[PDB]
């Protein structure tokens with residue numbers, strides 16, 4: 030099982046060379062996406078039954 | 087509401103529901119059995135013994151699951167062989183919850199043999215471990231097991247040549263087919279932790295054409311009768 | 322005076338109605354409780370509910386007031402509903418016994434030929450027998466003594482009619498139930514009978530436990546049926562043939578009538594409030 | 608050989624880089640956010656007709672038609688608005704544990720213990736559904752399948768390998784290897800260029816569809832991952848496992864952001880999906896309950912009780928109007 034070891038180490042070294050951003054930036058980009066699309070989310074903010082396809086036509 | 091398209095849609099839905107109910111009623115009239123065992127454990131021999139003159143009550147080969155459909159004495163059986171599923175059992179073993187019985191096939195002649203993965207692992211011990219794992223699952227706590235002890239003649243020749251003490255160090259008895267076979271049958275039955283709920287039916291696979299299928303039929307009818315008795319409060 | 326009897330009959334009727342309605346509702350709104358046996362248990366519950374909401378209020382009003390204050394036509398309607406709904410309940414017990422006998426003795430027909438149509442046919446036959454026992458008195462077989470007393474509601478005393486109704490409502494169902502449950506008791510024992518010493522002892526203890534369980538269950542079913550309906554039908558068969566020298570106390574007659582009526586309250590307990598599936602469904606509802 | 612030394616050295620280097628990129632946790636960043644609050648959902652439609660345990664469902668892109676797969680060998684196309692069965696496809700093998708509905712709405716796929724992914728043509732001249740192609744080549748049970756396109760479908764099976772199929776030809780265009788355990792779930796990125804797969808080796812891997820190699824590996828769970836779903840943004844994904852924990856991983860941060868676990872849940876997650884905005888994380892559990900999680904707060908916002916056996920499949924419409932949960936009780940419930 031030595032041939033697969035070369036492939037595994039190549040995979041790890043290819044994974045380790047990617048560019049990474051700060052976790053604060055990632056959390057901020059998730060917050061921005063959630064707040065920008067919050068008004069467009071029927072489940073988060075209940076929709077009136079007039080335009081609710083599953084309650085009234 | 088009163089539109090033609092809505093009426094057509096509801097009519098199609100009702101027709102589809104009728105077809106589904108008919109198909110479900112037809113499928114409920116079938117006894118489902120799960121076939122298990124080791125690799126060369128005589129599962130193929132048992133399956134071929136089932137399919138003699140009675141079967142079927144550009145497709146691509148599955149090789150994942152094989153369904154054997156046979157009818158014996160006006161009873162429809164569907165036997166599912168999952169030998170070709172080389173994967174983790176716990177991720178799909180719950181799909182077979184609700185089968186009438188489990189046909190566990192173990193070869194008596196593999197006690198001397200060992201697995202190819204490592205020398206210090208008997209094939210019979212692997213079969214016993216599989217039987218213990220499958221008999222005490224949280225899904226098969228209510229399901230009876232039909233145990234088949236295949237290769238009785240090969241087992242007799244092997245024990246006449248090689249003793250049973252290698253497979254069972256604690257074994258102490260005369261090297262004869264009857265005593266060794268009874269000991270193996272008792273060892274497999276002692277792995278049933280759910281004694282009060284399920285029953286193990288053991289049969290020694292024989293060359294006679296209809297005895298194995300007859301044993302399966304008797305075990306299945308006994309299971310159905312005992313389930314009815316339990317429902318009635320009489321068992 | 323009669324307030325205690327009024328409260329006792331009211332609570333008995335309320336318990337019977339509540340139990341039967343609960344069983345019917347549980348079968349209706351539960352999806353696991355949708356098989357042939359539970360359909361028969363639901364039809365029995367419906368029949369007992371009809372007994373408890375159509376016959377029991379009028380019987381209690383008759384008992385409390387000690388006289389019939391509803392009219393001769395209403396008296397005939399009461400007698401007809403009483404015989405029809407109670408014969409249907411007894412024949413539902415018989416049909417449940419027959420279905421259990423078929424399920425235990427014939428696994429092949431249990432798997433293949435057992436369909437809800439069989440349950441519907443059994444219910445139809447039970448109600449048809451109830452009609453054939455309760456309707457013929459409404460059409461003939463009425464001596465003038467039945468309506469001779471305006472302040473009374475008594476069944477026909479004709480020997481032929483009393484034999485026909487009493488036998489075809491209790492004694493044929495009783496004999497059929499006894500035979501069916503004896504055969505079921507034989508089959509259950511046959512199935513129960515069929516270190517090493519420890520395993521053998523454990524198996525023997527298990528076999529005696531199962532034998533005790535089956536004896537207890539069959540005893541419960543048969544003893545409930547007997548103690549509820551046998552005392553009434555013995556009197557219903559003897560008194561018509563004994564015109565004199567067999568005066569019947571009102572207390573004992575009312576007691577044997579209300580034992581028969583309370584069979585409808587006991588039936589949901591025996592057939593629904595004991596098996597595991599119904600208990601699980603009721604707990605899920607609650 | 609000696610390759611394990613530099614293998615663990617590279618593992619340590621990756622861990623050190625991930626720790627260096629971790630300056631503040633997601634909770635600290637989102638602390639000032641007001642809570643989404645307790646969320647009220649009631650069953651609006653109850654789709655009836657399945658006679659066995661339901662293992663998979665998938666919504667249409669029109670947010671009205673959904674496909675469900677169950678052990679009775681039926682593949683029913685529902686109309687969630689009117690509770691009408693548009694189609695009922697009889698499967699050759701009744702052991703089906705995945706289904707997908709094509710984005711174009713023309714095809715439906717399913718697969719199971721049989722190692723074949725069957726493609727069914729819904730829209731045909733005669734109006735009767737027929738098996739378009741049967742995709743064979745997997746050596747394990749098909750766990751998940753997603754229509755990459757009207758002609759491409761990506762599958763994940765219990766042979767530790769995900770595959771990319773060409774439905775027109777029927778051959779595996781690309782095979783994605785690298786997983787150590789059975790691959791249980793699969794989710795396509797919204798841009799239709801990447802996908803993540805959660806396997807039984809307690810890890811999730813990000814794959815490049817065109818290039819066909821594992822870009823990233825995320826190892827946070829303590830048990831096998833049963834469910835995976837991208838964030839609507841496409842830069843994150845949530846994973847459900849038998850560890851009774853849901854974990855939000857970020858592609859760019861290359862590590863875990865939030866853990867969605869409670870002391871009162873000890874049952875594994877079978878299904879995971881996000882709301883339209885991504886603020887709600889809906890997860891199905893083995894205790895026949897679905898918990899709505901504040902994806903940015905790790906606080907439960909609601910419970911979708913109403914199933915009896917075990918919520919096995921769960922999905923949210925593209926328009927986000929409703930969420931459908933199918934369970935082993937043979938009933939699919941639209942919640943909205």
Ligand SMILES: C/C=C\C/C=C\C/C=C/C/C=C/CCCC(=O)O[C@H](COC(=O)CCCCCCCCCCCCC)COP(=O)(O)O[C@H]1[C@H](O)[C@@H](O)[C@H](OP(=O)(O)O)[C@@H](O)[C@H]1O
Nearest residue numbers: 317318319336339340538541590591592593594595596597
């Ligand atoms: C001398 C030696 C030995 C003998 C001496 C002593 C020991 C035995 C004495 C005789 C027995 C009397 C009655 C025993 C009741 C009893 O223990 O019941 C058990 C549990 O119930 C409760 O806990 C409570 C009861 C149910 C809950 C209340 C239901 C509602 C009541 C009011 C209804 C109206 C208002 C709603 C359940 O019953 P079980 O465990 O006794 O055993 C069986 C039962 O006898 C079979 O009839 C039944 O068959 P089925 O007809 O298909 O249902 C079986 O399924 C099974 O339940």
Ligand SMILES: CC(C)CCC[C@@H](C)[C@H]1CC[C@H]2[C@@H]3CC=C4C[C@@H](OC(=O)CCC(=O)O)CC[C@]4(C)[C@H]3CC[C@]12C
Nearest residue numbers: 533534536537538539540541542543544545548549580
């Ligand atoms: C009309 C109403 C008021 C009657 C109320 C009483 C009944 C519920 C009684 C009458 C006869 C009784 C039965 C008489 C004897 C037995 C055997 C007894 O013993 C056992 O456990 C059986 C096994 C064994 O003895 O080894 C269990 C209860 C049971 C079935 C009894 C259950 C309760 C019954 C049906």
Ligand SMILES: CC(C)CCC[C@@H](C)[C@H]1CC[C@H]2[C@@H]3CC=C4C[C@@H](OC(=O)CCC(=O)O)CC[C@]4(C)[C@H]3CC[C@]12C
Nearest residue numbers: 326329330333384387571572575576579580583586587
């Ligand atoms: C097994 C479980 C379900 C208990 C069942 C008990 C019943 C059989 C009991 C409960 C209340 C009893 C009743 C309470 C009071 C009376 C009034 C009593 O009145 C008289 O005897 C005097 C007036 C007359 O009848 O002329 C007659 C019996 C009766 C109807 C009783 C009949 C038997 C009943 C219905």
Ligand SMILES: CCN(CC)C(=O)[C@@H]1C=C2c3cccc4[nH]cc(c34)C[C@H]2N(C)C1
Nearest residue numbers: 399400403404407408474476486487490581
């Ligand atoms: C004064 C009370 N009355 C007149 C209404 C009765 O005698 C009732 C008539 C009955 C009766 C007669 C004959 C056959 C039968 N099968 C089932 C029953 C039945 C029910 C049975 N109830 C319990 C008492």
